[PDB]
Amino acid sequence: SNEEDRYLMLSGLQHFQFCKRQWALIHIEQQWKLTVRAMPIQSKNLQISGICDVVEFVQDSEGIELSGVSGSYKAFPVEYKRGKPKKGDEDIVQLVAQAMCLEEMLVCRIDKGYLFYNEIKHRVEVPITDALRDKVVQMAKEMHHYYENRHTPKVKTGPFCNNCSLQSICLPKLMNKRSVKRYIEGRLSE
Amino acid sequence: ASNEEDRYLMLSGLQHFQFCKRQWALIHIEQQWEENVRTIEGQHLHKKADQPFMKEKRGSKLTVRAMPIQSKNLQISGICDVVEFVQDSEGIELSGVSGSYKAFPVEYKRGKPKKGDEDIVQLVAQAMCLEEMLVCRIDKGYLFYNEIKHRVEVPITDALRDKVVQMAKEMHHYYENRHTPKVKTGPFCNNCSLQSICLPKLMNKRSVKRYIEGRLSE
Amino acid sequence: MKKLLNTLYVTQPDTYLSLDGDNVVLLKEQEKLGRLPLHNLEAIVGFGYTGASPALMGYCAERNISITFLTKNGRFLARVVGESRGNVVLRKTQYRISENDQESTKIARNFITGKVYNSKWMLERMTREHPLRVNVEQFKATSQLLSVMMQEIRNCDSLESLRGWEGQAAINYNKVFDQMILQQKEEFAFHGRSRRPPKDNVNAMLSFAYTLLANDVAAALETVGLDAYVGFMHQDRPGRASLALDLMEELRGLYADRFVLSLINRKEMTADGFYKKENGAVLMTDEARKTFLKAWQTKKQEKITHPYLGEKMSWGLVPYVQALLLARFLRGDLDEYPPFLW
Amino acid sequence: MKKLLNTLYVTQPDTYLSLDGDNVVLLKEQEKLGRLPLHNLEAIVGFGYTGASPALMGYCAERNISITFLTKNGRFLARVVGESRGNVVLRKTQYRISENDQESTKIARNFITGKVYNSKWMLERMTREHPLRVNVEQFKATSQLLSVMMQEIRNCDSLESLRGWEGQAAINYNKVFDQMILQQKEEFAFHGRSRRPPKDNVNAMLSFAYTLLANDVAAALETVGLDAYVGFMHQDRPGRASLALDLMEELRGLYADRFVLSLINRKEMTADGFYKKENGAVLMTDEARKTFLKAWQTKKQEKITHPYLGEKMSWGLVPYVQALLLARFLRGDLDEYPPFLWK
Amino acid sequence: MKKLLNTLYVTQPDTYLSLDGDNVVLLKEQEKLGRLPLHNLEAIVGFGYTGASPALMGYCAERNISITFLTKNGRFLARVVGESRGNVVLRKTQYRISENDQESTKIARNFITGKVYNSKWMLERMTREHPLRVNVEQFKATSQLLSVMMQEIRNCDSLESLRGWEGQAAINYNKVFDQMILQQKEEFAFHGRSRRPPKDNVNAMLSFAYTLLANDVAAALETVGLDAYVGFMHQDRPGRASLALDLMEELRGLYADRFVLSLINRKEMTADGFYKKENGAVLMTDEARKTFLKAWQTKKQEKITHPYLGEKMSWGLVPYVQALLLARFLRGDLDEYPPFLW
Amino acid sequence: MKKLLNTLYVTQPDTYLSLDGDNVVLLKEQEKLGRLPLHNLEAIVGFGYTGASPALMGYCAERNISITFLTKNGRFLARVVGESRGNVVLRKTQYRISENDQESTKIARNFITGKVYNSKWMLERMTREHPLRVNVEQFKATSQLLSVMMQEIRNCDSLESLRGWEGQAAINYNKVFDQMILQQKEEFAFHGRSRRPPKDNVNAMLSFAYTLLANDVAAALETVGLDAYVGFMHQDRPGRASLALDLMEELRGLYADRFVLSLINRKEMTADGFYKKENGAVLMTDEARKTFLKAWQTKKQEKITHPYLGEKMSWGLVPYVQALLLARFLRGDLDEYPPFLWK
Amino acid sequence: GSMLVLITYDVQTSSMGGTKRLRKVAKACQNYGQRVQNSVFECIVDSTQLTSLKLELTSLIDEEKDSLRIYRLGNNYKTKVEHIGAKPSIDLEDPLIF
Amino acid sequence: GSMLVLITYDVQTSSMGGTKRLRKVAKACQNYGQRVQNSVFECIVDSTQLTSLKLELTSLIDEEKDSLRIYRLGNNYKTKVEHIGAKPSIDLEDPLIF
DNA sequence: GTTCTGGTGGTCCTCAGCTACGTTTTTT
DNA sequence: CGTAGCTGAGGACCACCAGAACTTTTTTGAAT
Ligand code: SF4
Ligand SMILES: [Mn+2]
């Protein structure tokens, strides 16, 4: 009756949008209105836990009732993620993940999302659709498949690899090598 | 030329003439002077050694520094760095003390020994000046170089004296002509202190005609 | 080959200058605005009632630091001159050449060659990179007119007639210079010359630019060791810095006029910058003065390559090096003095 | 303070200069000392660490008056002037005449006649003062010889010949130079000329004195725009003030030799201040040099009359105005340069 | 990619170490001897009687700063080992690899291959530079034999056999090693690679080099998160932290022996610095030990390249990377551990 | 101090361990406090911000005596050791047993037997001292249920069956624990059990005490040489010390829950120093945490007698001793691991 | 790149938080480096350690009352550093045989 | 040219002529560069001026009692200096209008 | 208006010294 | 023993205050 073991952190959802091997490097090898903050949020169908950064509960007639207070409120998510707006949707995944976790907590649907840009100090608005949630479900089940097998994957190095702090552990150059067989025959010849 | 003593040239111009013919022209015609690292350090050495009005004797010998000495054969005047007087009954008695002493001129510089004559020339000329004051003959000369902190001996020969006489006459002629010559550039002028003046880069190149005519035509 | 030291411009009135050790200190009734090391300065331009103790004047004179006084709008109120050096042969040769008309006529040939070439080059560059917004055909026609006149002026042997051709060439060039109103409204239109009164716009800036260029040309000519009061051009009117104007002639075509035109097209200034009293000609403000000085100093740090010397140097080092090329020619090194053909 | 030939002088240090209305005003730490006009002046010469008033400079420069700031001892510090600079035609005419023989020889003969004029009445005056211990007949004979050479050089026009009578007159004055000594003859003796490495005591004195004079007279020409490095009788050579030496000749006797005589006769200095050199040369001592300079400063403050004008002046101002006269000779109505004919 | 850091050899006896902030302070009866920052100090080595406060041991151990105590003449005592920083999967895989002969013999194959390759090429190079002082032919023959060993070393699958082959690798080299020396053959009385733990001269230096290399390699392996001194391939017989010796078998032949040989050839120390005890043991004088340590560190600082890609690294990083590669072998990155081969 | 098993557990802080002959001397600031032989000692464990004599550590490092240094609170710092002694065999055996399942099941059933024995005896005691206002026959029925739990666990043989039968007793423990609260029952209750964001204050106190005891047991497991992140009952997980949680499930009775109950009773804490923020989590205040830690230290300083060895000691040493026996099980010196058992 | 940097502070002791800020900045900079002169510390750090030191040290000092300057020389610092007096320093590339 | 050079000095005023030495050193060093903190100066010089200053100082101070350090930051000094507090220094290469 | 010299005083700066303590639910 | 909190006791260090003063040859001096 230990349901705690099968639950992971939400932040690990980010690293499958960038340098897939980094997730195995950190989580596997273990090497390094109301404006509520720090919400522990868990979801069972997708089986993931985490902490939502900011939730804004806004009063409206057509909202959803909250526990302990009568009425109806929306629970818009706000996350502080610095950087420039980027095409590889590395930050929208965690937004949609926590949004759908909160929605699974209440069994309903919303189509609004807030995000913070610290370096530009920008408000950005994002709706969500089925094309994102299906990809999230597939990515989450594939993550479970990887985690339960204790398997470290291999990915293309890319130009970004001069930025991952694990470049002394990730060892990017061991992707396209001649293998030890070429070393063996070279030492045989010489 | 009030009494023919006004037509006296500097000893210091000899070395400049020997190295860069225009450098001596620059220093002693247009009265220019610019300093770099080496010349500043050398000047500091000279002023540190420029401490008159004291004498040290070790029982037999004595030293004298900053001597105003002139020679009429070349009509050249200047100041010597050091001369050492040694106790021996061979020279002529000198004023200021008793007994017979012999003279040996030594000057201080900061640098490696030079492949050319250059520095030694000065002492050569220096020797001549002394032989015109004490009425004697000198065939031995002394040097100290500070960069290696080392003592170098030089003899005195008549070929050197003749060469000094020749260059003295030539530089008298240049002074009377008020003429600045041209000399080969080479890698000489990278510590040539007056480099931003005697503009050696412009000598070896083409003249003014063709450049302006070409740029005017096209 | 030098460093192009920085320059100091004092604008606050009733400022007093003192010397302590080797540092220049600005005071205002025992309240000090600051102190600077003098081993980084070349010129000090005082504005208004700027009193300088004699010791500062002497110290800056013996180390070739030029001090100039202007009251409010860059006039010729005064300069500062020091004592003599051992450059007797240079001054002697300069006077001897000035006495003879012929060598002066070749020098004038070279100066007017610089005139014509730099003018034609600047106007053809203006015409080339610009569409029908500019009068391309008339500019090119004036270019061929100048190109025709340049051969004739290259072989002149008299001063009065050469003055005639340079005057007519200046009129011809002004006839096309009267058009530069591209990116500015009509209130900044050139409407003739006004020597004493800055009656209109632009010309008020022109006077300040001319003063600021002349006070640097004079400083450079004092730097070289030459005496700049017997001109090789113009009639030798006694009591004027003749060679200052003589040398700044060829610089006038690019050093200040082009900067002002670039400022006007870039609209770095606005019509409200200049104010007028009852007559007052046209007056500039403290903000206008600060902006002009900042832009001037910023441009002076630009880096170019000299055509004849073929070396990379700061643009603000045109007037010294150029003047330096004269001194060697006074020793017979070259056959004639080279112009500026940028 | 004192105005002479359209020029203003200031001699007392620590005295500010300002402008009131159209007049110059002398001040001394908020004490008013004098007020003078400005309408007809030409230039202002100052010797104080004053600074003046900037409005004064602006107005004077706008009216074509050049101000010249010096030090309290007589160096050159700065020349604040508008576009006129003071001298353009003056300097160009000086240089044009510097290459011509007749006018240069005229100026030369003026130099010779004035200086030997002064020298021979100096000999006569010292003979009159001291008949007891002086063989006055020899000095009288030299005086008649000097008068003869006066009359003979009054109509000469060749440079080298003038150099010749310079040589003979200098030799005669040397041969009479020995005898004006009257005290401490034991070691203070004169036996010829040694400009380079000085020899035999008193010689050194003269040389040093001469040097000072040059600087002083140099400043004089600097005040008037005359070049101090291009001489008329002397030839131009780099590193030497030819024209300063040319003008220094008259002032050599009274202002240098009489000065050293007044120093020696009063026992101001002795052999203790002179150091010896191994080759026989004589050198100077720091305390001796400072005392010599203090006595020189004391003598510079003496007040005498000017023979040519009569206005009272101090010694320190004499070389300047005379050079001014030479400037006025180059551009002016003066028939001939007036020498310092002083008795 | 990592940066090499210093060490710290405390030679004065009767000392004490202490922590203060992030600094180590060297104390000796309440008068300080120095203070050093702890972010550029990758090891601490004690000599004689040294102490440490438990706070210092904890901080160093949990921040990968190895302590080590030695007595008088480099006798090992009481290394300091801290906590287990995790990485359970790598440790489990390593422990599973042990007790199986197949993979153990594979890794032994690679290890012995590296050792023999290094010895052969070092000998070949030596006879290549200067042949006049040595007998070339014998060396050549030995190389041939060593080459054959390669095949056998690759063509085996039992740990017992390779161990036996080890003996042959000892008997072919030891006799040769005598003529490695070129100078001081009389001063440095040398009896082959024969060793005596009581020491017999020209063995004190070799023992010192072995001790220092062992400490460095043990720290490097414990940094990566595994253990290979009592591990899979070497013998289990206790009291011998010698799989670390087995990981440095490819190094002790090159890194330590070549260093000692260069030290002998270059006359860097002489027999004056050595002495012998009454019982027959030999000791090194203090100045000799200081000079030896200076030579060791200065050698460590020098930069070389690697056979894999050519990336630059110093000497001291050669052990550490050799540890890291091993872990990367156990994560499925490489087919088998690629050894160190010059 | 010296336990019968050959280890030293010096616990008095500010104590210097020095060597005299072949013996250990404990000095309390310059006074000879204690003396003990070293003939058969196996390990020395020292508490407190203290030191050790360099000679002593050098001497002990030779004869296979590892010296472990822990601070006076219970955090584990260092282990001075020569070549590692008695650790590699323990670690390899631990990993081998972890890979296996039957021995792990035996160990897990032993742990569960200890837990249920502790719970049953605590319930019997509680119904003994205060049979006044409590459901008593229900407690006897729970005791017989715990006895059938005894029987099933001691003849249990499957991992899943062991986990399920462990979970079955947990709920009965939960209701009886809610029944335990006697004093201040009105405001503190155990209506439910909350792990994630513990609702109700008792759950938060339980989590806090569990965290403290888990950290202490982890230090206990590390100080003897066994890895804590590989377990026998729980499965593998990174960042989780499974064997520590096994010892938690054994010892979460007498030493953990009684502390919280005694804190609730005796009026040693009020609800004012407790918070409630929007979900049921109780954010402890600073003063309450200070008092909690002080009470924890005071209880750690209590004196008892070990049921198995029979030797007097403190509570703080109880974890370490337990872990040591586990090591003695894996090394082969013992047949079983009784935490609290008759056998 | 593990380069040399130099840090100089100057904290006012007159204000309310003078002594405490002085003591805390001195002790919070002595950790990362060494004292070569009073108020002049020099250290050898990479980019990350220096960034952490800057962020940690910009909070102890108080702006509008104190001054703090950081000068970075470079990895080739052996040629751009000179000591002429009589307070010798200890380098951190010495083998350090104490 | 015109490299930036930073000079620091710590003289001993407990000596016989400490006060005199400190005053002389301060005045001598002030002639070439600015002051940013007590006992530190920043200046913009070339090799010639640096040599002159170095000889002046080493002739001015005594050894065995005082310390003096010199640093040269090269030609790119603009992008290597960072400032936090409230003691600004006037740069000598900006247009410099008062 | 500058240079140098004593002399004073109030602000930075580090070391020596004495008192009083030492534990926290587990996020990148 | 290590981490903070406060003292206290000398050194470094710069801005002022008051006072006395304020002048000197002509010659050497680098070059990877
Ligand atoms: S830098 Fe490259 S190798 Fe390293 S974690 Fe990122 S993607 Fe993987
Ligand atoms: Mn010499």
mmCIF file with all atom_site columns, N, CA and C (backbone and C1' of nucleotides) and ligand atoms in Angstrom, chain B residues 81 106-110 119 142-145, chain J residues 29, ligand 2:
data_model
loop_
_atom_site.group_PDB
_atom_site.id
_atom_site.type_symbol
_atom_site.label_atom_id
_atom_site.label_alt_id
_atom_site.label_comp_id
_atom_site.label_asym_id
_atom_site.label_entity_id
_atom_site.label_seq_id
_atom_site.pdbx_PDB_ins_code
_atom_site.Cartn_x
_atom_site.Cartn_y
_atom_site.Cartn_z
_atom_site.occupancy
_atom_site.B_iso_or_equiv
_atom_site.pdbx_formal_charge
_atom_site.auth_seq_id
_atom_site.auth_comp_id
_atom_site.auth_asym_id
_atom_site.auth_atom_id
_atom_site.pdbx_PDB_model_num
ATOM   1  N  N     . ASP B 1 81  ? 82.875 60.413 -17.756 1.00 0.00 ? 81  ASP B N     1
ATOM   2  C  CA    . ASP B 1 81  ? 82.200 59.770 -16.633 1.00 0.00 ? 81  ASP B CA    1
ATOM   3  C  C     . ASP B 1 81  ? 83.154 59.540 -15.468 1.00 0.00 ? 81  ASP B C     1
ATOM   4  N  N     . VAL B 1 106 ? 87.386 55.442 -17.665 1.00 0.00 ? 106 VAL B N     1
ATOM   5  C  CA    . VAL B 1 106 ? 86.314 54.455 -17.694 1.00 0.00 ? 106 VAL B CA    1
ATOM   6  C  C     . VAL B 1 106 ? 84.979 55.185 -17.695 1.00 0.00 ? 106 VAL B C     1
ATOM   7  N  N     . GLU B 1 107 ? 84.051 54.712 -18.518 1.00 0.00 ? 107 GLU B N     1
ATOM   8  C  CA    . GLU B 1 107 ? 82.718 55.280 -18.601 1.00 0.00 ? 107 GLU B CA    1
ATOM   9  C  C     . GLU B 1 107 ? 81.689 54.171 -18.435 1.00 0.00 ? 107 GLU B C     1
ATOM   10 N  N     . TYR B 1 108 ? 80.507 54.548 -17.958 1.00 0.00 ? 108 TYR B N     1
ATOM   11 C  CA    . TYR B 1 108 ? 79.451 53.601 -17.634 1.00 0.00 ? 108 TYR B CA    1
ATOM   12 C  C     . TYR B 1 108 ? 78.338 53.686 -18.669 1.00 0.00 ? 108 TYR B C     1
ATOM   13 N  N     . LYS B 1 109 ? 77.868 52.528 -19.127 1.00 0.00 ? 109 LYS B N     1
ATOM   14 C  CA    . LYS B 1 109 ? 76.723 52.453 -20.018 1.00 0.00 ? 109 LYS B CA    1
ATOM   15 C  C     . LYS B 1 109 ? 75.862 51.268 -19.617 1.00 0.00 ? 109 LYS B C     1
ATOM   16 N  N     . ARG B 1 110 ? 74.642 51.240 -20.144 1.00 0.00 ? 110 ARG B N     1
ATOM   17 C  CA    . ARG B 1 110 ? 73.677 50.189 -19.831 1.00 0.00 ? 110 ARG B CA    1
ATOM   18 C  C     . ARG B 1 110 ? 73.311 49.481 -21.130 1.00 0.00 ? 110 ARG B C     1
ATOM   19 N  N     . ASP B 1 119 ? 80.172 52.486 -28.892 1.00 0.00 ? 119 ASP B N     1
ATOM   20 C  CA    . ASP B 1 119 ? 80.522 52.921 -27.543 1.00 0.00 ? 119 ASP B CA    1
ATOM   21 C  C     . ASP B 1 119 ? 82.017 53.162 -27.392 1.00 0.00 ? 119 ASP B C     1
ATOM   22 N  N     . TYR B 1 142 ? 89.100 51.506 -20.059 1.00 0.00 ? 142 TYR B N     1
ATOM   23 C  CA    . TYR B 1 142 ? 88.310 50.695 -19.161 1.00 0.00 ? 142 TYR B CA    1
ATOM   24 C  C     . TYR B 1 142 ? 86.846 50.938 -19.482 1.00 0.00 ? 142 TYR B C     1
ATOM   25 N  N     . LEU B 1 143 ? 86.025 49.894 -19.370 1.00 0.00 ? 143 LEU B N     1
ATOM   26 C  CA    . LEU B 1 143 ? 84.583 50.053 -19.512 1.00 0.00 ? 143 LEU B CA    1
ATOM   27 C  C     . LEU B 1 143 ? 83.862 49.186 -18.492 1.00 0.00 ? 143 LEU B C     1
ATOM   28 N  N     . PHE B 1 144 ? 82.666 49.626 -18.110 1.00 0.00 ? 144 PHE B N     1
ATOM   29 C  CA    . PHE B 1 144 ? 81.731 48.825 -17.337 1.00 0.00 ? 144 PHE B CA    1
ATOM   30 C  C     . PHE B 1 144 ? 80.362 48.870 -17.994 1.00 0.00 ? 144 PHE B C     1
ATOM   31 N  N     . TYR B 1 145 ? 79.770 47.699 -18.227 1.00 0.00 ? 145 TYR B N     1
ATOM   32 C  CA    . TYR B 1 145 ? 78.415 47.589 -18.769 1.00 0.00 ? 145 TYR B CA    1
ATOM   33 C  C     . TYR B 1 145 ? 77.506 47.046 -17.676 1.00 0.00 ? 145 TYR B C     1
ATOM   34 P  P     . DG  J 2 29  ? 76.691 58.231 -21.133 1.00 0.00 ? 29  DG  J P     1
ATOM   35 O  "O5'" . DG  J 2 29  ? 75.115 58.041 -21.298 1.00 0.00 ? 29  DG  J "O5'" 1
ATOM   36 C  "C5'" . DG  J 2 29  ? 74.254 58.379 -20.230 1.00 0.00 ? 29  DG  J "C5'" 1
ATOM   37 C  "C4'" . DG  J 2 29  ? 72.812 58.400 -20.688 1.00 0.00 ? 29  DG  J "C4'" 1
ATOM   38 C  "C3'" . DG  J 2 29  ? 72.480 57.426 -21.797 1.00 0.00 ? 29  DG  J "C3'" 1
ATOM   39 O  "O3'" . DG  J 2 29  ? 72.182 56.150 -21.252 1.00 0.00 ? 29  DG  J "O3'" 1
ATOM   40 C  "C1'" . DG  J 2 29  ? 71.327 59.536 -22.020 1.00 0.00 ? 29  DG  J "C1'" 1
HETATM 41 MN MN    . MN  K 3 .   ? 80.149 53.763 -19.687 1.00 0.00 ? 2   MN  K MN    1
#
